């Protein structure tokens, strides 16, 4: 008989329950860990993708406190170029009083790698990357544990993210490898095909609440990627345990992102697009799709919204700070017709609200 | 692991079973209290929101038996003025035979007030309200206690409503606090974003389950506020134990709401907007959002179509009264396909009903 | 607590699997019984509705074998007319070889009735009808239980159908009050609202199930009534372990059914009410809306066409009868996905199908 | 009571753990059996529909390894001409190294018969026919079972494929008549009627699952049949336990597929129809629809891309055969907030994706 073993939940099927609060949402701290040796000062993360990802994006991420990852579609020098970018970057120090910075004083950045790329390695390193992401579509394989082994036995104290993985049997693999951070996330992405094409995939919030309980047995911190739609998204990965999260749609149509804007129907639009898509690769079978998304303003002006509703949840509850946070957490298990009713609902929406489209 | 307490369920979820029964619907009595001290006649009142509840939407609900609760968007001076417009208001002593009125023949009138207005509770209580609502995003809350405390210590008989909760530790803090009444809903609401902004939120069936099984032990009636869509919700609401129901976007479209009629597209609307939205408020992270509502006409034409639904709502299930409706209830959960089954399927309806839309 | 007594299922949450068989279609036997003394020679019954069922649907539906029931909305006299048009309706003989006919070979027919109405029970007993109809929103009431008491003592030998229930509990009140059969369904009709006015109903198939095992004790014939959008419903109606069922959409749009054709958009439609709509009716508080189907030609036509599913469906079962159906029967139940993949998918319909639209 | 056996489910229900691996997509084994004494390189099969394989489909099916199996609503002539041509068809042998072919170097072809079909049988042998399928809507029958024995007497070493079914008890009765497959599927096909017609079936997923189990005992290889809408049902399917997959929709939009393209609104497509339904079969009583899919190129293209993903999948897994696919192969159960972000989310797809539609 086939083995199912468990009934696996996303982020449409919690919510989190309110708790006694003395805590207004201005004054929780939203600092976290990105990996055992960085933390950030907000636990948002640039999607490593050519249309979310590059200098500039990461630039404005790590302002905010944050990170942004350079993606890998591109030769070794041009990403050596993009980091350094990034690095070199540093008004400023309280127009941006958050800002994510390393102890020279310079914007902290992260870049993709993939499997066996030790020559992309090593110029990353020299350009001064504080963190590298070896990213694949699974993480789980013989290929990305023999990277990790070979990257840390060369640059012992190199932060290395590693994914992406589903399961506690991958956390327990990757962290035994000594991965300074996992990323959590097959098949969630907006853009992403993979449960589609291949059947494989876990819903995200139960992947991520099975990796973080392995996971935190090595103390090794859980990055939630793909699958993030609104503000309370973000508020529910990080209650159930991860420490930072990966976003790319949300990020995709801001002024900081790569491509330029197109109008279409007389509204204003940006590429987004999987990074496994026809496009991004280039008979191939692809993971992803090539898409659009509404332009959204600035990075700034989203981060604000994402990171408000952050705010407005962890006040909610009652938490001083996100350790706190994952600590009161107590979540119920809706229907569609509890969804239905958490959303918009009876009435017809006049005007664009900044949170919720 | 993450802890999920349970799986809540809204009013979509269920249904009520029929009972013998010996009564008619327009035998039944719908009398019920709002607080530990007063009662209404009607179990309905009005949204304290600025698209809804003013002197004039107050003064017809009280007339009709139940209670309009003037809010709070507004400077004290102009809420005393509300407040004394419906005290002042009293052809009509049969015309509205079921009027709620106070021992001075006046009718009944709440007011909203916010946390730390002791200001605006002076002013309105020697314009003579009746009760005063303390409501906040998140009445679970220190803000709220204290000030609920402050309130009875200097006006130990002033009827005092507080809310919103959605949990039984949130009812019994209040309820210790010394409140005569608490308001159930976090996110239900038609214009709420709570749920999807902050990820917080509790389907309000198992709300007001949880919080009238506590409130129960201190004798302190449970309002249950926001997601009624249909006279049936209504039914639901109360036959769980709540004592009362209060309604944002089923009277925003009325005659007696603020806000004036406009036409689109050959119909006529009103403004409905949530009281956190952007609109209401004047960067701010909202959690409601602004929008409209067809034209219904009288409040006393939908009132009656509501309180219809109810009566008929008792008639099946046999009971002569709201208390008696409560002990006799017995409900059945409901799937998507049990729900496409209730509402109206395979007709496509020609002509408007007054209680379906 | 609130008291949840069951989970209960409606005919879109199962399916029949298939069994053994040794039979084909056209040779199963789909004779059943409606009452206790009258049998019928096919299953279907056409609705007591002003929109369905007079004289000549009544014919046509005792002719293929079945039950017409000449609804109540009209006075006694022409309810009279209606009931002696059918008794005396009778190259028939073989063109209609399965008709349903007393001992004086004359076409059965029903008439409906309400409480209290003992002159129209007086009329139509001497008009020679052949059953007795009592339907109320509430069958499990004190003025139906009477009504079926004061019928009983003055027409010992008439046979009576009370409905509608949706309980046990109800069909054990009815039976010991000794109707002859028990018609279920409480919020289930296509043009009912009962459910979202009031707040009360049974999903049909839990309905059919809990009423079935209740009257088998008294061996009395459950009627389901009402929900039944395809032919594939009549058989699980049937195989659940009701007797026969009752059909109002599926007729309301046939040459037989009062009413004339009309043309919409270059197609024709028939008027098809609630008889607890508006219109029917003539402030009222409605349970039912007024609405349209398509015109679908003959009733034979369609009766063809649900007979033919239902004996599909034995022959599945390997059923030789409706006894034997009922006893082989075993369901599953199935989720959203199952019903999307039950119904035709991925592929764009462009031939009109007799008995699937 | 009713007997509800199980809660079933179908491919949209469920989704595939990734496991550790060692292999890449390319390098994965995906040859599988047809039957106990037939192995196919590819694990797919062409369904048996006069839209869908004649002797070019049934042609290119085993040049790319897999088979077709000809339809049988034609004369006997006719399919023995359709069979003669696929058999006689063999540049091309490593233009198709993975040809599917019998001991004397000649593509391996299927055709269907039905009950009683003696004289068929006779002709399609003497033509070489290497398997027959012997099709009905209901395999669990006595004409079915007496035709697998007279087949078998009259010819022991024909490769026989009786369908369909979807019970274990049904997979034991045609296992213990001898056959060398069973194919599954009762009512998931995509023109697939019966379900709603006849509220026979089971959901997919759960159909498989319970009769490989049973099959299993006999050594006797499953087909999975119906109801495939994307590559990654094609990997859940072989995941569960079944053999082969039979797939229609997917295939009848090409160039090989009989019929011929036809523009509509500036877009091309190809009829697809149910063999059930009323315009294959010539009042009838259908049990499928008439329809039309998109163009969609050559087989192979579309081979390719459903070939694609399947080697996704057992890498995903870590597979590095079938055999292993199915022993490593992990489920969980999901929602439908969960296929709803398995699938593209809140991003406009502007390029056609080569496996996603
Ligand atoms: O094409 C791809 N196929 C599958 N997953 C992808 C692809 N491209 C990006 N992703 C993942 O999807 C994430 C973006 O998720 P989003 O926030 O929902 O748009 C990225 O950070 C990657 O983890
Ligand atoms: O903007 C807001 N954000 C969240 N909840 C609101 C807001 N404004 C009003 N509400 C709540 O929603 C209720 C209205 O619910 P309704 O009957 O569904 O429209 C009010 O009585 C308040 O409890
Ligand atoms: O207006 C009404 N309100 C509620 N139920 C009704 C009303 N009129 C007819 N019905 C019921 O609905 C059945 C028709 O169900 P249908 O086959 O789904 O259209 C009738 O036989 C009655 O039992
Ligand atoms: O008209 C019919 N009624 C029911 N099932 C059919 C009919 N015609 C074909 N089928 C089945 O549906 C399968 C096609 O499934 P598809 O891959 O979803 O299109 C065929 O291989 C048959 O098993
Ligand atoms: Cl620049
Ligand atoms: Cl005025
Ligand atoms: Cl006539
Ligand atoms: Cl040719
Ligand atoms: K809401
Ligand atoms: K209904
Ligand atoms: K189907
Ligand atoms: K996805």
């Known amino acids: 008989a086939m083995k199912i073993v468990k009934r696996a939940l996303t982020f449409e099927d919690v919510l989190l329950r309110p708790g006694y609060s003395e805590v207004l949402p201005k004054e929780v701290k ?14 948002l993360i640039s999607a490593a993708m050519d249309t979310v990802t590059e200098h500039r994006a990461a630039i404005m991420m790590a302002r905010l406190g944050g990170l942004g990852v350079i993606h890998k579609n591109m030769d070794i020098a041009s990403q050596v170029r993009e ?21 020279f004083g310079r914007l902290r950045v992260g870049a993709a790698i993939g499997v066996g790329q030790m020559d992309r390695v090593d110029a990353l390193v020299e ?4 963190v590298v992401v070896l990213d694949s579509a699974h993480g789980h394989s013989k290929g990305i544990i023999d990277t990790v082994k070979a990257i840390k036995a060369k640059y012992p104290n190199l932060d290395l993210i590693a994914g992406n993985i589903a399961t506690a049997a991958a956390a327990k693999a990757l962290c035994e490898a000594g991965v300074d951070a996992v990323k959590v996330g097959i098949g969630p992405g907006s853009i992403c095909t993979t449960r589609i094409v291949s059947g494989v995939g876990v819903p995200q919030i139960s992947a991520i609440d099975e990796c973080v309980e392995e996971a935190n047995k090595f103390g090794v911190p859980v990055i939630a990627d793909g699958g993030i739609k609104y503000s309370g998204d973000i508020a529910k990965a990080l209650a159930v345990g991860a420490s930072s999260v990966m976003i790319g749609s949300l990020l ?19 590429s987004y697009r999987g990074m496994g898509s026809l496009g991004a690769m280039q008979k191939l079978v692809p993971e992803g ?9 600035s990075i700034r002006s989203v981060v604000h919204q994402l990171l408000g509703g952050l705010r407005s949840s962890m006040g909610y509850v009652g938490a001083k700070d996100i350790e706190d946070f994952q600590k009161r957490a107590e979540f119920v298990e809706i229907t569609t017709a509890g969804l239905k009713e958490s959303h918009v609902h009876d009435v017809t929406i006049t005007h664009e609200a900044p949170n919720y489209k």
């Open 289 to 297: 799709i090539e898409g659009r998304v509404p332009y959204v303003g």
């Open 252 to 270: 995709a149509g801001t002024d900081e992102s790569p491509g330029e804007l197109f109008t279409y129907q007389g509204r204003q639009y940006k």
């Open 127 to 130: 350009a001064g990357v504080d």
């Open 30 to 43: 939203i600092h976290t860990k990105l990996t055992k040796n960085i933390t950030l000062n907000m636990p």
């Open 83 to 103: 980091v350094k970018r990034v690095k070199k970057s540093e008004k400023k120090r309280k127009e941006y009083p958050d800002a994510n910075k390393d102890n």
